[PDB]
Amino acid sequence: YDTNERGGLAYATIKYATETTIFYLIYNVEFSNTPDSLVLINPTYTMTKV
Amino acid sequence: IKTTPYLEGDVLSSDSGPLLSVFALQEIMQKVRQVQADDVQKILDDIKALAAEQVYKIVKVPSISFRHIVMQSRDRVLRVDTYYEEMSQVGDVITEDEPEKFYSTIIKKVRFIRGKGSFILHDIPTRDHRGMEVAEPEVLGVEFKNVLPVLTAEHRAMIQNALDGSIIENGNVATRDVDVFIGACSEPVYRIYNRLQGYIEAVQLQELRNSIGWLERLGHRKRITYSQEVLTDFRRQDTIWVLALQLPVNPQVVWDVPRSSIANLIMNIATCLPTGEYIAPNPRISSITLTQRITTTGPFAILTGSTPTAQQLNDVRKIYLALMFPGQIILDLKIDPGERMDPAVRMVAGVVGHLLFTAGGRFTNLTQNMARQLDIALNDYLLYMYNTRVQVNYGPTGEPLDFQIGRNQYDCNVFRADFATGTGYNGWATIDVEYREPAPYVHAQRYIRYCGIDSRGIGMTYHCYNEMLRMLVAAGKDSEAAYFRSMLPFHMVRFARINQIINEDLHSVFSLPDDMFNALLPDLIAGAHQNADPVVLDVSWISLWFAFNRSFEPTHRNEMLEVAPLIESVYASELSVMKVDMRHLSLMQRRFPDVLIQARPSHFWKAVLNDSPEAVKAVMNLSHSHNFINIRDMMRWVMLPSLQPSLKLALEEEAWAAANDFEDLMLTDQVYMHRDMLPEPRLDDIERFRQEGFYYTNMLEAPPEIDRVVQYTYEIARLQANMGQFRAALRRIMDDDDWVRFGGVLRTVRVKFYDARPPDDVLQGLPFSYDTNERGGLAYATIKYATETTIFYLIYNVEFSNTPDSLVLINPTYTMTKVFINKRIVERVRVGQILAVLNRRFVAYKGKMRIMDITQSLKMGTKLAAPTV
């Protein structure tokens, strides 16, 4: 989404991304790390689904 | 891209030359000049200037409407309204027998008052005072700079308090948008200002939306690049929009003007026709040797290899110009009685013309005489046995091409011209005009397809060319048959380009409507033109052959193609304004038959056209020089209801309503004559006489009594002048102490000011002129009933060296002319009542607010604006 102004009128643009990605996450763990190591203080959000 | 070289006397050259948009106008103007025989840039920039029109002006400070005059006194001054001061000199002297000058003066006065009444305040100066916001005295409509250095301290303090009392009622309001203050302004211009303001606060967002939609629909057809952006409906909190013009112009407004075909053609070809360049079928033929170009014998061999002269390129341009405009440009042959040529060129031109042009069926490009000459030339070529002989059987009739030729009997009668069916030319058995879907312009929806080809060039042919090849092969002209066969792709590319240019670029409101386009050919067959007049261009024999070989390449598009709708709307609005002005003139003639000299529609049209934009003036003058007009056309045109709404129209209606009272136009018929005494006051006390502010003028503050005055008339005055008793009658009636009214006609009135004794010609001036000393022996004594009359004000200046009886003359001196106008143009006002003039309400904007015209923003249609839903 984008918007701009020329002259005395307001203008805006909308587009859809044509390339989408699907990823796979493999969680590797080792004896050293603490249980709280893999817990972030605040959430991380993901949007796209396919 | 450059043209193939052409010969300039003895040297080759390849300069492009003048633009096709400029060459066309010169040719049309030359033909018109030939019509009345018994600079182009100056016009082109004049049309181009219509894209930056304004009918208003943003002003910092309103013009002062009142001013004060000092009469060597400190107790009272004169208040003068400068509106009438500027108004009295707008027009020229009005005579009793020149209606054209009268109506031109009226129109000029109306235009002047409209121009003066339109202004918008942007940001007024202001000054704070005791916590209150007060507008500075400069923004007010009165000036009193010279008043201050003479007033006493008391009156100075009083007027200072009066100035400090000009508080802005909403000034203390925070985050406000506009400010309002009381001021002084003349009523005629205040009315126009109020009307303009009232038009302003009316929001017209839907009008802009519709205009943008129509621009997109037009850009659909004009092949304009599509911007990725889509317009949004938004309003900035710090912007105020103004829209002087409405975009969807009605074509009836522009096509209802009588004898406007030439005008519309010129405007369209100026605003839309693009330039181009000419290319030979084989490039760089100037480099190859002549021997490789001339290979055989015959007329075509002689024709091939010759290079065209520079002059014939102009005729090729004329031929192409006629090609772009089917029914509006027609060709004819230039034959000089004392010239000659090699018959081969005539033979080749006759052969080529049948394939190159079209005639009959739907429209024609050439006159009947040209068709007959081309048929005769083709006949002569067909009976030219230059290389081989074939048998031929002649027909019973003596008409050309009435024979059968070749071993296989081919009938050549089909190639004779016939405008009913168009067998002999490109209109043979093919359809070229069609309708597909509604166009952006409702008046013109047709499509033009030369040779039946469309853009939505190898192998395509048409019936006429195939028949041409068949007859050429049957006649035994085998050599040129191959040459014609090899030329098809070039010919089809040229005609495809012509169709592209016609259908894509030359589309505008000035294009001819479909009905008149269909009516041209039957009109031409009938011979008596009606409601349409074509223009004929003249070409030479060799020009046909040289045009058959040279193509047209649109190197550049027209510069003004982007701004066509704006000038179209401006032209339509100007036409509507002229129509409304003429209707108002007709109403004025209706209301006052007893004081107006006469009525004439032709004079109305001439007067309204006299004051107009120069480009419109020139275009209309050319159009009406080509074809004449009559009273019936004017009567038909002044009654059509079609109009193009705009700010100009509303301002004109308000100005006409304000100027309905002709006394505001400084025209008065209440001119009187009476012998009066020039006063000479006593001077017993110089200061006592000084402080009362004595002055004298010929003004009458009240009308005289209904009796004791004799009413004169133009007919009575003329009869008395012819009797020779006019002077004696007036002398007797003035010795009788009676008044006289010189009514029956409007007279121009001027205003003058004097301090010393005015010139004798002014004080003793007469409202008429009567000359009796002549040796002509005819017309006897000439009388001019209507002449200029002058308003004069006298200020008596006295010095301490004057004796009490210094102004006493031995014999009395008299004055004659008196007049009543019923308006206080000049007032004697005490110093205490100077500031009472401030009674009008004014509204202004702020610096934070920005005002701009949306019309410049709709320069071109490139932005879509949400779904219509």
DSSP letters for B219-277 = HHHHT----S-EE-----TTEEEE--B-SS--HHHHH-STT-HHHHHHHHHHHT----B
How many Cα atoms are found within 13 Å in the side-chain-facing hemisphere of B795? 16
Compare all CA atoms of chain A with the CA of B205 and give the residue at the minimum distance.
A9
Which residues on B lie below 8 Å from A13 (Cβ)? Answer: 228-230
What are the Cα distances from residue B20, in Å, to B2, B278, B634?
15, 11, 35
The torsion angles phi and psi of B422, rounded to 5 degrees, stand at: 65, 45
Choose among B822, B859, B551, B440: nearest CA to B669: B822
Q: Would you state the structure tokens that stand for residue A21, as one six-digit string? A: 């990605």
State the Rg of chain A over Cα.
21
Q: Is there a contact between B184 and B64 (Cβ–Cβ < 8 Å)?
A: no
Q: Is there a contact between B570 and B50 (Cβ–Cβ < 8 Å)?
A: yes
Using CA atoms, how far apart are residues B596 and B45, in angstroms rounded to an integer?
40
Which residues on A lie below 8 Å from B230 (Cβ)? Answer: 12-13
Indicate if the alpha-carbon torsion angle B817, B714, B744, B749 is positive or negative: negative
Which residues on A lie below 8 Å from B204 (Cβ)? Answer: none
> Based on the number of CB atoms within 10 Å of its own CB, is B208 exposed (0-12), middle (13-18) or buried (19 or more)?
buried
Q: Is there a contact between B190 and B840 (Cβ–Cβ < 8 Å)?
A: yes
Using CA atoms, how far apart are residues B212 and B216, in angstroms rounded to an integer?
6
Using CA atoms, how far apart are residues B557 and B560, in angstroms rounded to an integer?
9
Using CA atoms, how far apart are residues B268 and B558, in angstroms rounded to an integer?
11
What number of other Cβ atoms are within 10 A of residue B232's Cβ?
Answer: 14
Query: Does A13 contact B at CB distance below 8 Å?
Result: yes
> Based on the number of CB atoms within 10 Å of its own CB, is B508 exposed (0-12), middle (13-18) or buried (19 or more)?
buried
Report how far apart the first and last C-alpha atoms of chain B are (Å, whole number).
Answer: 47
Alpha helices by DSSP H, B550-673: 564-591, 601-610, 614-626, 631-637, 647-658
Query: Does A2 contact B at CB distance below 8 Å?
Result: no
The torsion angles phi and psi of B129, rounded to 5 degrees, stand at: -155, 115
Query: Does B851 contact A at CB distance below 8 Å?
Result: no
Which residues on A lie below 8 Å from B231 (Cβ)? Answer: 9, 11
Compare all CA atoms of chain A with the CA of B238 and give the residue at the minimum distance.
A8
Query: Does B230 contact A at CB distance below 8 Å?
Result: yes
Q: What is the DSSP letter of B849?
A: S
CA distance B58 to chain A (A): 18
What element of type H or E holds B840?
A: strand B840-844
Q: Would you state the structure tokens that stand for residue B528, as one six-digit string? A: 């008596």
Is B234 in contact with A7 (Cβ distance < 8 A)? Answer: no
Give the resolution in Å.
3.6
Choose among B312, B323, B211: nearest CA to B273: B323
Is B852 in contact with A12 (Cβ distance < 8 A)? Answer: no
Q: Which of B228, B232, B856 sits opposite A10 (nearest CB)?
A: B232
B476: left (phi over 0), alpha (psi -120 to 50) or beta: left
Using CA atoms, how far apart are residues B738 and B729, in angstroms rounded to an integer?
12
Is B232 in contact with A12 (Cβ distance < 8 A)? Answer: yes
Say if strands B789-795 and B747-754 run parallel, antiparallel, or are unpaired: parallel
Q: Is there a contact between B471 and B401 (Cβ–Cβ < 8 Å)?
A: no
Query: Does B860 contact A at CB distance below 8 Å?
Result: no
Q: Is there a contact between B113 and B659 (Cβ–Cβ < 8 Å)?
A: yes
Query: Does A9 contact B at CB distance below 8 Å?
Result: yes
Q: For B700-734, what is the HEC assignment?
A: CCCCCCCCCEEECCHHHHHHHHHHCCHHHHHHHHH
Which residues on A lie below 8 Å from B852 (Cβ)? Answer: 7-8
Compare all CA atoms of chain A with the CA of B229 and give the residue at the minimum distance.
A13
What element of type H or E holds B516?
A: helix B514-526
Query: Does B588 contact A at CB distance below 8 Å?
Result: no
Using CA atoms, how far apart are residues B310 and B14, in angstroms rounded to an integer?
10
Using CA atoms, how far apart are residues B43 and B36, in angstroms rounded to an integer?
20
Using CA atoms, how far apart are residues B178 and B845, in angstroms rounded to an integer?
5
Helix, strand and coil percent figures for chain B, each rounded to 5: 40, 15, 45
Query: Does B237 contact A at CB distance below 8 Å?
Result: no
Q: Is there a contact between B311 and B590 (Cβ–Cβ < 8 Å)?
A: no
CA distance A20 to chain B (A): 22
The torsion angles phi and psi of B306, rounded to 5 degrees, stand at: -80, 140
Mutation target for B interface from A1, A9, A11, A15: give the one with most B CBs within 10 A: A9
Q: Would you state the structure tokens that stand for residue B504, as one six-digit string? A: 């894509």
CA distance A17 to chain B (A): 15
CA distance B848 to chain A (A): 15
Using CA atoms, how far apart are residues B329 and B821, in angstroms rounded to an integer?
59
Query: Does B284 contact A at CB distance below 8 Å?
Result: no
Query: Does B178 contact A at CB distance below 8 Å?
Result: no
Q: Is there a contact between B484 and B493 (Cβ–Cβ < 8 Å)?
A: no
Q: Is there a contact between B124 and B179 (Cβ–Cβ < 8 Å)?
A: yes
Query: Does B867 contact A at CB distance below 8 Å?
Result: no
State the Rg of chain B over Cα.
38
Indicate if the alpha-carbon torsion angle B851, B857, B858, B863 is positive or negative: negative
Q: Would you state the structure tokens that stand for residue B695, as one six-digit string? A: 């002055």
Which residues on B lie below 8 Å from A9 (Cβ)? Answer: 231, 234, 854, 857
Choose among B135, B141, B151, B162: nearest CA to B62: B141
Q: Which of B232, B236, B241 sits opposite A11 (nearest CB)?
A: B232
Q: For B390-434, what is the HEC assignment?
A: CCEEECCCCCCCCEEECCCCEECHHHCCCCCCCCCCCCCCCCCEE
> Which residue in the block uniquely carries the two structure tokens 């004696």?
B728
Q: For B735-800, what is the HEC assignment?
A: HCCCEEECCCCCEEEEEEEECCCCCHHHHCCCCCEEECCCCCCCCCCEEECCCCEEEEEEECCCCC
Using CA atoms, how far apart are residues B720 and B718, in angstroms rounded to an integer?
5
Using CA atoms, how far apart are residues B854 and B845, in angstroms rounded to an integer?
18
Choose among B284, B310, B387, B432: nearest CA to B6: B310
CA distance B854 to chain A (A): 7
CA distance A1 to chain B (A): 11
Query: Does A7 contact B at CB distance below 8 Å?
Result: yes
Q: Is there a contact between B243 and B855 (Cβ–Cβ < 8 Å)?
A: yes
Distant-in-sequence, close-in-space partners of B211: CB < 8 Å, separation ≥ 6: B246, B247, B248, B858
Choose among B321, B329, B327: nearest CA to B21: B321
Mutation target for A interface from B212, B234, B238, B239: give the one with most A CBs within 10 A: B234
Is A7 in contact with B239 (Cβ distance < 8 A)? Answer: no
Using CA atoms, how far apart are residues B621 and B605, in angstroms rounded to an integer?
12
Using CA atoms, how far apart are residues B748 and B95, in angstroms rounded to an integer?
9
3-state secondary structure of B666: coil
Is A11 in contact with B241 (Cβ distance < 8 A)? Answer: no
CA distance A11 to chain B (A): 6
Using CA atoms, how far apart are residues B331 and B419, in angstroms rounded to an integer?
15
Is B236 in contact with A12 (Cβ distance < 8 A)? Answer: no
Choose among B697, B803, B810, B800: nearest CA to B758: B697
CA distance B850 to chain A (A): 10
CA distance A8 to chain B (A): 7
CA dihedral B635, B636, B642, B647 (to 10 degrees): -30
Choose among B75, B56, B28: nearest CA to B120: B56
Compare all CA atoms of chain A with the CA of B242 and give the residue at the minimum distance.
A8
Using CA atoms, how far apart are residues B487 and B356, in angstroms rounded to an integer?
12
Q: Would you state the structure tokens that stand for residue B832, as one six-digit string? A: 């205490």
Distant-in-sequence, close-in-space partners of B637: CB < 8 Å, separation ≥ 6: B256, B257, B258, B579
Q: Is there a contact between B180 and B841 (Cβ–Cβ < 8 Å)?
A: yes
Using CA atoms, how far apart are residues B801 and B858, in angstroms rounded to an integer?
73
Is A7 in contact with B241 (Cβ distance < 8 A)? Answer: no
Mutation target for A interface from B205, B207, B232: give the one with most A CBs within 10 A: B232
Q: What is the DSSP letter of B553?
A: B
